[model samples]
Target: GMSGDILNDIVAACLELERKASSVFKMFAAHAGSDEARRFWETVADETRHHSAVYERLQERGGRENLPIIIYKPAETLEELEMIGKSIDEQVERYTEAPSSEAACLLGFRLQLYLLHPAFASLCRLTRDASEDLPDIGYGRYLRRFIDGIGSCGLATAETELLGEALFRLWNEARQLAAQSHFDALTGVMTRAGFFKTVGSLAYAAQRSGSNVGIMLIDLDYFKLVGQTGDRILQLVAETITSHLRRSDVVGRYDGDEFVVYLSPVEPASLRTVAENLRRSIEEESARMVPVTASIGVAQGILGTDVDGGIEELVRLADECLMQAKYTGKNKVVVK
Candidate 1:
C-alpha cells in the first residue's frame, strides 16, 4: 500500500514535467522558422499539453488503490529529461553536421528516437493504466502534421505511421521498466542500490541546513534463522515502515532483514517517536504471518550549526542503537 500524499506528489511531478516538456517543444517550434519543422514542433507541444491533463483527471479521482506501491524518488525524472535533451541535441547535431543533406537530417531524427523512444516509453509505464488518459497518441498527430508537410519530399505515409507506432510502443515499455526498477522484487521498499542512493542524496541535502536529521536502522529479529515464513513478513515490513513515515521522510530496504528511514530536520525526540510507531506497526502487520517482530535503532544526525556526518555514517549511529536494542530485548526501539 502507498500513501496518497506520496503518490499524489509523484503524479503531480509527472504532470509538471509534461508542462515543462510542452514549453520546450513550444520554444523550439517558435524558433524553427516558417516551415514544416515549426508545424512539427507545434504539434508536439499541443500533444504534451493534452497529455498533462491526464494526471489532473487521475488525481481528481484518486484513491490509494489507484497508486502503485513504488517509492518514487523524483530525482529519477531528471534522467528522463536529460535523455530527452540528448535526443534534441542529436537532432541539432545531425542538422549542423549535414547542412545540405536531407539524408543527414533523417539520420539525426532516427538517432533521436533511440533516446526518445525509451524516454516516452518509461513515462507510460510509470503512469500504467492511467496512460490511456495520457495517451502517447502523439504519434498519429505527428504523422498528420509532418507527413503532409514532408509529402513533396518523398517519405511515404505508411513509413511515418510505422515509425511513429514503434516509437510510441517503446515509451510504453520504458515506463513498465521504470516502475519495476523502483521496487524490491524479493523483499520490500526500494531495491538496494536505489534505496541507498536515495538516502545518500537526502542525507547530503539535510546536512546543508540548520536542522537536525534523524536516522533509524530496523532489523527484523531472527529473520535470518527463520526460513520460508520470512518472505511473508518482509513486504509487510516495508509497508509498515512506510505507513509510519511522513511524505518528507524516506524508508528503504537497507540490506537483508534491515530497513532504514531518513528523517529530515526533526528534533531528537521525534526520532524516538517515529521509531516507536514503526515498532508498533510491525507488531500489528506481522500478526497475520508467522510470529515475527522488529528492533529499531534511532539517532539524531551529528547536525548542528557547524557540522554533521554523511547520511551513511549517520545510519551507523542508528546501528549502535540497533545493537543496543538487540542486546537488551527485541520487538523494541532503542533511541540515542
Candidate 2:
C-alpha cells in the first residue's frame, strides 16, 4: 500500500509537469514557419502527450484501487515558473507573425529536451528522496525516506529501462532538432552551417560509392532592386529554385542574394544542365513575383579523391566563375 502511494504521487507530480510542457508545444505547432517544421514539432508534441500518458496510467488497481493524495497546491506559484512563461510568450508572438518552422521545432525540442529541469528534479525527488527538503511542490515530506518508504516495490526491468534507456533514444529527435538549426527558416533550405555539414556528409557517402559531387554557387542579379518589391517575393524565388531540382539536390541560402546547391554524383556536363535549369526556372517562376535572373558557377569533383580539393576548393571555383559570368553577362552559367 505504501509503495502504491509513492508511485501514484510521482505520477501525479509528472502529470503536472506534462501539463506545463503541453501548452508550449501547442504554441510551436500553431506558429511554425514551414509545413515540414510544423509537422515535426506536432509529432514531437504528440510524443510529449505520450510521455504524459506514461505517468497518467500508473495506478495499479483491484484490491488497492485508489491511492491517497500526498501533494498539496500552495496559494502562490514559483517565480521561476512565471519567468519562463514570459519569454516563451514573446517568442510565440515573434514566430506567430512571421512563422519560422525552424524556430518552432528548435524551441519545441529545447523545451522538451533541455529546458525540463523542473520536471526532472520533481521526478528524482519522488523517486529517491522524501525529506524536509521536498521543495515547494512535492508531498514527499509526508512519506517515508524514499529508499525504504515505497515498501519494497520494484519496477519491471523494462520500466526502469524506460526511464534510463527511453530518454536516450532521441537520436532521431536530436537529428531533427539539429536539422531545424541547420535550415534557414525562410528559405526552407539548409543554413550555411547545414550546408557545410551536408557537404561533409555527402562527400563521405559519395566517397564510398565512387560517384562524384558538384557545387553550383548562384547569385541573383539586381537583387537590391528586387528588394524594393519586399522580402516576401524572395520566398517565390526560393520556391522556384527548390521546386526545379531533382529530389536528390540540396539548396541553401548562402548570403543575402546567393544560393548554393549540392548536386549528387554528377559529372561536369550534368552539373551544367542542372544549374542552367535552376537558373531558367528562377527566371520564369519568380517573374510572377518580380523579374529575376542569376549568374551560376559550376564545379565537379570525384568524392574523397582530394581533401584540399573538396567543398571549400569547389566553393572558390564556383565563386570565381560566378564573377566571370557576372562580368561578361548577368544571367549566364560559367563552368570550370
Candidate 3:
C-alpha cells in the first residue's frame, strides 16, 4: 500500500496540471483575434476544467482509504508530474505576455503527450469503482476525446497538422508497447520486464546510499492442481504480498505461479522476518479465499559491496534457495 501523503500529492499534481491547462487556455481565449478562435479556446478551457474536477474527486476519495496499488512507481511518477507542472507554469507566463495560436497548438500537443502518460491511466483505474461524484467517463474515453479534439480543433497550421498526426501515431505505438509489456493483466503487478527495470534502479539507489537490498522469490504450492481457481489465487496472493510491504518495495508476477519481491534499505534479519510474515499471511489469507500456500525464499546482500549486478545476483540466490524449499517441502520459507 502507498502512503496516503504521497498518493494524495500525486493526485494533487494531476489537479494542478489540469488547473493550469485550463488557465492557459483561458489566457489564450482572452487574447484571441477572432470570435471563432475565442469560442474554441473557451470550450477547451471548460473541458480542462471538467478534467480538473475529476482529479478533485480522486483527491477526495484518496482521503477516505487506501488507493489500489498501481504499476508505476509513485515517486517517479510524482516527479514527472511536478516537472510537467513547472513547464505548464512557464507556458502560462509566456502565453499571458504574448499569445500565439500556433505556439499554443504546439504547447497543447506537448502537454497532451505528458497527460497521456500511463500514470494518468493508472488514476482512472484507481477510481473505477469508487464512490466519488466524478463524471467518471473513463480514461480511454478521455484519451479518445483528447485525440479527437486535437484532430478536429481546426486550429492546426500546415506544420502543426503534420506534426500532430505524426505524434499521435507515435503515441499510439508507445501505448501499445506499454500495454503489452509493462503489467500483468490479472494481478496488476509489474511483468518481468517492468519489474526488473524498476528494481534495477532501486537497487542502484540503495547501493549509493550504502544500504542493503533483499529479494524474495515466492512460488505457490500445487498451483497447477488448483486448476480453474488458479487465477483467483494469483490475485489473492498478489494482494496479500502488497499489503504486507511498503510502497517503496516492488512486486512482480514473475511467471505462472511465481512472484518476486524487492525490498531496499533492509537488513538480512529483517528480510527473514518479512519473508516469514509474508508466508504466514498468504497461507491464512488464501485459506479464507482459495486455500493455497506460498513457499518463499529470501536472500539479502549489502548493495555497498558490489553495485554492479547486485539485483541480478540477489534474485539468483533467492531463486536458488527457493528451489531448495520446493525440493525439501512445500509451504516453507528458506532464507540464505
The predictions' CA RMSDs to the true structure, in order, are 10.8, 20.9, 7.9
lDDT of each: 0.60, 0.58, 0.71
Query: With candidate 3 superimposed using the best TM-score fit, by how many Å does residue 301's alpha carbon deviate from the native?
Result: 0.4
**Candidate 3: pairs in clash:** none
Candidate 1 runs further than 4 Å off: 1-153, 186-188, 222-228, 302-309, 328-331
Q: What lDDT would candidate 1 get against the real structure?
A: 0.60
Which number leads on TM-score? 3
Let me know the TM-score candidate 1 reaches against the reference structure: 0.54
Rank all candidate structures by their TM-score, best first, as comma-separated numbers.
Answer: 3, 1, 2
Query: For residues 106-130, what per-residue lDDT tens digits would candidate 3 score against the true structure?
Result: 7777676766666654565455434
Report the lDDT tens digits of candidate 1 across residue range 272-292. 677787788787778777556
TM-score of each: 0.54, 0.49, 0.62
Residue-wise C-alpha lDDT for candidate 2, range 22-141, written one tens digit per residue: 666666656756554454445555656665653454344222554222221110113334445555567667766776657665565555544353323333333223233321322243
